[PDB]
Design a protein around this ligand. Structure first.
Ligand SMILES: C[S@@+](CC[C@H](N)C(=O)[O-])C[C@H]1O[C@@H](n2cnc3c(N)ncnc32)[C@H](O)[C@@H]1O
Lengths: 75, 88, 106, 92, 97, 328, 93, 108, 97, 80
DNA sequence: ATCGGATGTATATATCTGACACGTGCCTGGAGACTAGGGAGTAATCCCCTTGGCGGTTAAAACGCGGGGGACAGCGCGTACGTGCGTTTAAGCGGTGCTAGAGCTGTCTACGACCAATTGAGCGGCCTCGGCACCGGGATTCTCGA
DNA sequence: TCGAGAATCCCGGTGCCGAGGCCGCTCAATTGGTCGTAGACAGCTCTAGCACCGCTTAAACGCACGTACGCGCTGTCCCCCGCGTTTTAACCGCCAAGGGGATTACTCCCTAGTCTCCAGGCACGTGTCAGATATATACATCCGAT
């Protein structure tokens, strides 16, 4: 299924995913599409950030959701 | 009271005009034209700032507040013009 | 045996052991050799005699007996073979050689 | 209790001009000059001790450094006095 | 009838009169106020033990003298007698700054 | 042992003056202060200047007690006459009006002369250390206010308030919600505790409402102040001698700020010609723009040569543009 | 025998600042002498700097005092603002 | 035993830290070399070589070529002015000079 | 035929030799000069070839800087060409004589 | 044995060397003073090279010795 | 300012080559854990040295007025040097052939770090006195109007 | 070429404070022993510096010839020096406070040194492609001409 990730610049990116994929695979797909390294990505939805070891199904995310992406520095 | 550290400002005029003329007569010129008396002040300010900005670092490294004469001798040794007669 | 300093076997005047204690604890190498600081004291004594002879020679010619630093200044720069060792040294209380250019004379 | 090179310069002065003394500010100038020449010669012998994969400044590296730092005239007299000093120190 | 030299011969008295002597030339206490004003930066107040101030005066006097003794050569080279700003700015560029 | 009791224009809290005057430098007197207050309150409302022009002028007698006594005794009956006029058919001046720039400068100078007693003691510190003290003038802080237009939803935090005239000028200039100033070493903070009280009393005396502020004492490298740095709009630091050690830690703690924030400093955090490539992502310079202010004179009070002030901004779109244009 | 160099580290740091531009051999020798010369000058200044205060351990402060003396008045700020970021991340690990 | 992880990776550097340590010990610069020093020294050397190589690659890309040849290094060192005073007395081999003609020698 | 004005082939040789980066002095005269000047010291040297090339690059980078300085010192006299009393001024201001 | 080889540095090569620096017209007396300056500089460099390669008791002037002899005078040379 | 001839410089493709990116085996220098001895850190105390202020004396800086020597522009001439051309010479590339000498390895005699015992060479404090700065008074030297 | 007058060397008298020398006295130089190892010396393989020879030709040489510029002269004006007069702050001597520079003692944690383990980096092959050379061509530049 398609979901959207809304960044700050006005651009909306749409990825095709399944609810059972891990977040690492989502970050890898975004890295494939836009070239942004996975370590810099901090995804936020409904005031709660997502953890590396959990999945989209753990947070009750659904079809046609809108996610917010912010950029953070490297370490 | 008033502010701390009564500030010294606009003090390049200490190297006055006949003093620069005397310094010229050491070198072996005859007539000094009417426009050396700014360029000599510029060159002197550049040289004193370029020595003091090394002496202050050499005296920061020991964490003391007195710029001692050994620090001026070392900072002049690092630039190229060494200086005898002061213990270094 | 009787204590006898290392200068006397050298036939020198500068001290020998001070140069040894400076060359070891100045970190110029790891192990400082034996025959070297004698040679170093020798070259140092010859250099300071070569300066002080010209210093006193230009000190007697100016009707004084105390070597004032101006005599040292007029003794290094008037020579030619020592001008390339102190070639970027500004001796304090020094002054310049007496020099007027050839065009400025009336 | 700081050191100086005053008394040996005062000793070597008497072998040339036996009736003239030197002032204090000239003594400090000679004290700085001997210090600077010793600093330069040992600092050149150090860098000559690393371009040959050795580690002992012996009595040859000082001679090869003195034939480089001093100019073309004084070097002959410096080496012809230094080798006499070491061949006098050996026979004792 | 009031006696007056030719303009251009008091200077050739002052050349010998200042080359013979060896006193300090720039006035002492304005130079000390200048060298305290340059180090008035770096915020922390400094102290300037007086032997360092005199050492700095000897060094900052023995740098202008060589500059003028070189700019005299640069001014004589242009078949002129006096010096001028475009000779100091030549000597400082040839010197390597 | 007598006093020189004045009277305030609006309200009633008369400031007092003991007669042996506090000594200043060789040309500054407290008579200048009292005559300057009288001149500024005459410039405030013109009816007092109309009562001031007749029977007396601005000139003085400085050593005599009775002349300044007559100054106060005429000024007090002048204020009482316009109090009687103010209870007639006219309505008073509006209390919620912020003052102008000159009245603010005179009030800040008055509080700084009255509060601290021996200002030579401020130079007692540790050499070449973060603990060093250097004051910023009134004029550059006024240009700082008039440069960035701060709105009703901002927070002004002053890292390193010093004695703390900076937060006073900010709280009297704009109209934000709250303000903060934090400092470590106790010797300026003990003067700051009296600076607060004297500023509040004098801005009550002139009848000028300000913003809110709390001159706090702490240490901003502990974990308490990290979330409070990262929740604030505009930050005023003065780090000309902080060195590189705490500078990197401020570089780390600035990274969690919001969007549209601003940071000013006497030393630039990110360089002016900062290019961006695939190596220096770890620095904070990749996500901020810098711009040099106007190098005007009278800037600091440790030298006379002017220094720049490098207004920053947080703008996270440069990283987005670079990561979009990596693939082209 | 095998001789030391600085080659493959310079080639590694080139790829982080440019994607696909390699250096020729005689440029590799030039950078191999340049890094050696800057390291020689910095250590040779910090040696005499740790000698005028009668200490004997060239610590992580002597390099920070010598770098603000050797390099000019613009590169010094970036040199120390990278050196502190190196040492602070070295300790906290 | 733990897993062997090199010191260059612990600080986020690229130049070898251990090589710089072995050079500061054997070079007789002091008696004892501190452990906090050679990380800082490797970091300063790495910043300087990045600042040269960025301008070198920029001048190489401007002249329609992809290999950096030493003429590009000469055209990148001398043209900037903040890197001139550090390299103020070097003559880079196969170098060449900047393109420079004075203002008088041009024809009228 | 066609003949250029005197003073235009030089201002093309300026660009043609500033754009390039080759060596200028021919090799086998330079190697014979170095081998002949080294006969005054210790006898029967050998001169490994990379040292000869290094020495040539140094000997070119000396004269290019000397000529680029003496051109400034000759432009200062409001002349265009150079002359021996400009090299003998630049080499004295530089501090080698 | 070789002698009188300073005439290898010919006339148009010295003209080319002057052309690289940015001059326009070479007068007719530079072609002696430039040969003099070159002879002084090469003597003052090789007198520091042969001593360095004599200290190791070998008889070949290798390139590292020339790099050290130039590093002592003031013009240090990279690329080796 | 406007225009054509003629020459050089830069811009657009084709092949062909040797120098560069890269993968593999492998050795030695880097890393990990542990222990011992000292250099650096920190606190307390003395006391010498730097700043601050004042008041008197007066050298030297500040300012203005002639006026003469020199900076500077224009002009005219005569050599010296740029530019091109025909004759000429070593520069340079390759190829062969030789060997002195750079460079690595195996010993091991001699040479210098290190430490306890000993003491005199050399450093600070304190004295005496004369070489030398100062002053004033003529004797000689230099400059400038006639 | 000679007189007037300002400057400068010279000669003798006078007081002073910075060198020469002498004396406690302590800690760094000197003697006399070990013991570990850097380096003098021998002996070996083999890289690469040297001398020579031939062929192609790019470049060093001699020369005619024309011209832009180096250079000397004359003339103008402008600006910088000499000197007298009037401010001002430089300098010397004195007095007084206190803060920082040097010092001493006493801990303690960073860092040399040792042993063991192993992968990071270097030499070697091997492919392969960035550009060096070559050729055809459009645009800019210099130079005569209008
Ligand atoms: C340059 S002053 C700024 C004073 C005032 N805000 C201004 O701009 O004029 C820096 C101030 O920061 C304070 N400060 C320095 N280091 C600090 C620290 N580590 N924690 C808290 N305050 C500190 C000092 O007390 C000092 O007053």
């Amino acid at each position: 299924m398609q979901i959207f990730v809304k960044t700050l610049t006005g651009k909306t990116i749409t990825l095709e995913v399944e609810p059972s994929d891990t977040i690492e695979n989502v970050k890898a797909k975004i890295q494939d599409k836009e070239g942004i390294p996975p370590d810099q990505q901090r995804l936020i939805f409904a005031g709660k950030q997502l953890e590396d070891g959990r999945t989209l199904s753990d947070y009750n995310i659904q079809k046609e959701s809108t996610l917010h992406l912010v950029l953070r520095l490297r370490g | 009271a008033k502010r701390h550290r009564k500030v010294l400002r606009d003090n390049i005029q200490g190297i006055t005009k006949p003093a620069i003329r005397r310094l010229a007569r050491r070198g072996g010129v005859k007539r000094i034209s009417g426009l050396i008396y700014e360029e000599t002040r510029g060159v002197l300010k550049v040289f004193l700032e370029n020595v003091i900005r090394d002496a202050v670092t050499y005296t920061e490294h020991a964490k003391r507040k007195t710029v001692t004469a050994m620090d001026v001798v070392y900072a002049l040794k690092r630039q190229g013009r060494t200086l005898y007669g002061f213990g270094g | 045996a009787k204590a006898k300093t290392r200068s006397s076997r050298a036939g020198l005047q500068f001290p020998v052991g001070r140069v040894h204690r400076l060359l070891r604890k100045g970190n110029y190498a790891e192990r400082v050799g034996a025959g070297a600081p004698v040679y170093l004291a020798a070259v140092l004594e010859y250099l300071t005699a070569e300066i002080l002879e010209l210093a006193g020679n230009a000190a007697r010619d100016n009707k004084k007996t105390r070597i004032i630093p101006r005599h040292l200044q007029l003794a290094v720069r008037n020579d030619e073979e020592l001008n390339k060792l102190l070639g970027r040294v500004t001796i304090a209380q020094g002054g310049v050689l007496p020099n007027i250019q050839s065009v400025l004379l009336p | 209790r700081k050191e100086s090179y005053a008394i040996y310069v005062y000793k070597v002065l008497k072998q040339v001009h036996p009736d003239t003394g030197i002032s204090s500010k000239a003594m400090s100038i000679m004290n700085s000059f001997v210090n600077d020449v010793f600093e330069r010669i040992a600092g050149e012998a150090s860098r000559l001790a690393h371009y040959n994969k050795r580690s002992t400044i012996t009595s040859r590296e000082i001679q090869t450094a003195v034939r480089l730092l001093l100019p073309g005239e004084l070097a002959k007299h410096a080496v012809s006095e230094g080798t006499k000093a070491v061949t006098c120190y050996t026979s004792a | 009838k009031p006696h007056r030299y030719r303009p251009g011969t008091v200077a050739l008295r002052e050349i010998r009169r200042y080359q013979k002597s060896t006193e300090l030339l720039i006035r002492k206490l304005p130079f000390q106020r200048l060298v305290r004003e340059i180090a008035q930066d770096f915020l922390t107040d400094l102290r300037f033990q007086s032997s360092a101030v005199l050492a700095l005066q000897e060094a900052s006097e023995a740098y202008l003298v060589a500059l003028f003794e070189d700019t005299n050569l640069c001014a004589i080279h242009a078949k002129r007698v006096t010096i001028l700003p475009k000779d100091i700015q030549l000597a400082r560029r040839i010197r390597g700054e | 042992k007598l006093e020189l009791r004045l009277k305030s224009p609006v309200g009633a809290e008369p400031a007092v003056y003991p007669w042996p005057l506090p000594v200043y430098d060789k040309h500054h007197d407290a008579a200048h202060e009292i005559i300057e207050t009288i001149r500024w309150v005459c410039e405030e409302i013109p009816d007092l200047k109309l009562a001031m022009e007749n029977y007396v002028l601005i000139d003085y007698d400085t050593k005599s007690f009775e002349s300044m006594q007559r100054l106060c005794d005429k000024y007090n009956r002048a204020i009482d006459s316009i109090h009687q006029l103010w209870k007639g058919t006219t309505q008073p001046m509006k209390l919620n009006t912020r003052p102008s720039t000159g009245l603010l400068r005179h009030i800040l100078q008055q509080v700084y002369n009255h509060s601290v007693t021996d200002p030579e003691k401020l130079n007692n510190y540790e050499p070449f250390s973060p603990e060093v003290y250097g004051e910023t003038s009134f004029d550059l802080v006024a240009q700082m206010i008039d440069e960035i237009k701060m709105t009703d939803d901002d927070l002004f935090v002053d890292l390193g308030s010093g004695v703390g005239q900076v937060v006073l000028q900010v709280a009297a200039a704009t109209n934000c919600k709250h303000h903060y100033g934090v400092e470590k070493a106790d010797i300026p903070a003990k003067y700051a505790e009296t600076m607060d009280r004297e500023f509040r009393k004098w801005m009550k005396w002139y009848g000028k409402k300000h913003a809110e502020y709390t001159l706090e004492r702490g240490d901003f490298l502990s974990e308490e102040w990290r979330e409070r740095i990262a929740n604030t709009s505009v930050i005023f630091v003065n780090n000309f001698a902080f060195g590189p050690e705490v500078d990197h830690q401020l570089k780390e703690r600035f990274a969690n700020m919001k969007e549209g924030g601003r940071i000013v400093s006497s030393k630039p955090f990110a360089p002016l010609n900062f290019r961006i490539n695939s190596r220096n992502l770890s620095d904070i310079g990749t996500i901020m723009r810098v711009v040099e202010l106007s190098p005007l004179k009278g800037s600091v009070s440790w030298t006379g040569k002017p220094v720049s002030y490098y207004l920053h901004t947080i703008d996270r779109t440069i990283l987005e543009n670079y990561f979009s244009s990596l693939k082209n």
